[PDB]
Amino acid sequence: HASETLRGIRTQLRTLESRVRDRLESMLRSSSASKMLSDTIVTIRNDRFVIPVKQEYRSSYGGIVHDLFIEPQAIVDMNNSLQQAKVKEKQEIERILRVLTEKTAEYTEELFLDLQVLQTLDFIFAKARYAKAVKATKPIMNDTGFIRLKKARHPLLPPDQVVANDIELGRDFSTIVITGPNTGGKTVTLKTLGLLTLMAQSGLHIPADEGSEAAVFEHVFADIGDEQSIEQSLSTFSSHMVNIVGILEQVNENSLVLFDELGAGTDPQEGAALAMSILDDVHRTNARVLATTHYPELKAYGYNREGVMNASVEFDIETLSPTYKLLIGVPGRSNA
């Protein structure tokens, strides 16, 4: 149905092949000729139908010896016509492929616009399938630099292993200092606030409950590092200090800043003094700050400064285990 020429070539091929088979069969049912053959059956050599032939019978035949195997002279013309029909076939197919190229060339704008529409829809629908797949809510997303992660969860933990915490920042206070011994909830609270902020600022739903709010920061800053390897505790203090210097050069009122154990890896009094002075420097920019510390001196910090709030992580002395529950407004006590 592509072209009448292609239909005629298909008819020529099938009729010429049928004439080949009928001519071979008329040779093969001839009783006088059956003596000269190896077999009364068709065979193929070199992309041709051929007769199988007795080697001693050679000079009796009218045909091309392939191998005996012989292509009879009356069928050479038929096979040549079939070859010309294959040439006409591939010419027809290349012509039709050029016509299809033209018909695609006519609808270029439609194909590109449909491709853009479907890539937009696949992007939108994949985001929404992810948002349903982690059972997550739309954050109420604001220019006021304000956060309220209701019952917030660390996204990288299992939903049954994680502990849910209310985190609120950037309304009554711009800075929170989480105080207390190095219990595994301090750093996890920092990473939770940071992860959920980057998720939310990308329009990906967060593991926090309905009516949660999150902030449209112009920048996010982090000094969250592992104390890697005791061959390098001053490479840790120095690495933190180099990162802190880089944060202090760039921070503004539209920034989130996350600080893990400010001034760690040195003398605790100098570390606490550095930490207070760095927090005061950043706090004056009206940046949103979450900091952790084990330093006792920083337990007084959020009582003595307007716009700062103290927090701690709850610890069970009866089990010797962290509860990972954040207590906002309560400074951490030591239990050593």
Partner 1 sequence: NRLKEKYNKEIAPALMTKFNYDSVMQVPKIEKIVINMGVGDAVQNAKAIDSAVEELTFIAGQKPVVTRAKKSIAGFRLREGMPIGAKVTLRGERMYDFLDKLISVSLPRVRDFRGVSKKSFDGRGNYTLGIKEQLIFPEIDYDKVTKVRGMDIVIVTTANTDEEARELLTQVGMPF
Partner RNA sequence: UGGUGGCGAUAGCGAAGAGGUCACACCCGUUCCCAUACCGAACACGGAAGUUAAGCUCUUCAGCGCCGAUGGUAGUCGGGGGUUUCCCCCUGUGAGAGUAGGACGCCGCCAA
Partner RNA sequence: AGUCUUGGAGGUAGAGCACUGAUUGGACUAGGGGCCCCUACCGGGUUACCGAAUUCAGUCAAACUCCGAAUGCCAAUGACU
Q: Quick one: DSSP state of residue 138? A: P
The token duo for 67 is 């191998």
Q: With CA atoms as reference, report the closest residue to 289 among 186, 213, 196, 176.
A: 176
Q: Is 173 in the site for partner 1 (CB under 8 A)?
A: no
Output the smallest distance, CB 33 to RNA, in A: 12
Please give the Cα distance from 289 to 282 (Å, whole number): 8
The token duo for 300 is 């007084």
The token duo for 72 is 């009879």
Q: Is 67 in the site for partner 1 (CB under 8 A)?
A: yes
Q: Is 54 in the site for RNA (CB under 7 A)?
A: no
Q: What separation in angstroms does the CA of 60 have from each of 8, 53, 158? A: 38, 11, 89
Beta carbon nearer to RNA, 59 or 319: 59
CA dihedral 168, 252, 223, 297 (to 10 degrees): -70
Q: Give the binding-site size for partner 1 (rule: CB under 8 A).
A: 11
Beta carbon nearer to RNA, 56 or 318: 56
Q: Is 56 in the site for RNA (CB under 7 A)?
A: yes
Out of 44, 87, 126, 245, which residue is the one contacting partner 1 (CB under 8 A)? Answer: 44
The token duo for 224 is 């969250």
List binders of RNA among 12-41 (CB under 7 A).
Answer: 29, 31
Judged by CB under 7 A, the stretch of 58-66, 84-92, 179-187, 275-283 that binds RNA is: 58-66
Q: Is 65 in the site for partner 1 (CB under 8 A)?
A: no
Judged by CB under 7 A, the stretch of 51-59, 93-101, 190-198, 304-312 that binds RNA is: 51-59
Q: Give the binding-site size for RNA (rule: CB under 7 A).
A: 6
Judged by CB under 7 A, the stretch of 56-64, 107-115, 134-142, 259-267 that binds RNA is: 56-64
Please give the Cα distance from 101 to 98 (Å, whole number): 5
The token duo for 117 is 């529409």
Q: Is 38 in the site for partner 1 (CB under 8 A)?
A: yes
Assess contact for 257 and 221: CB atoms under 8 A. yes
Binding site for RNA (CB under 7 A): 29, 31, 56, 58-60
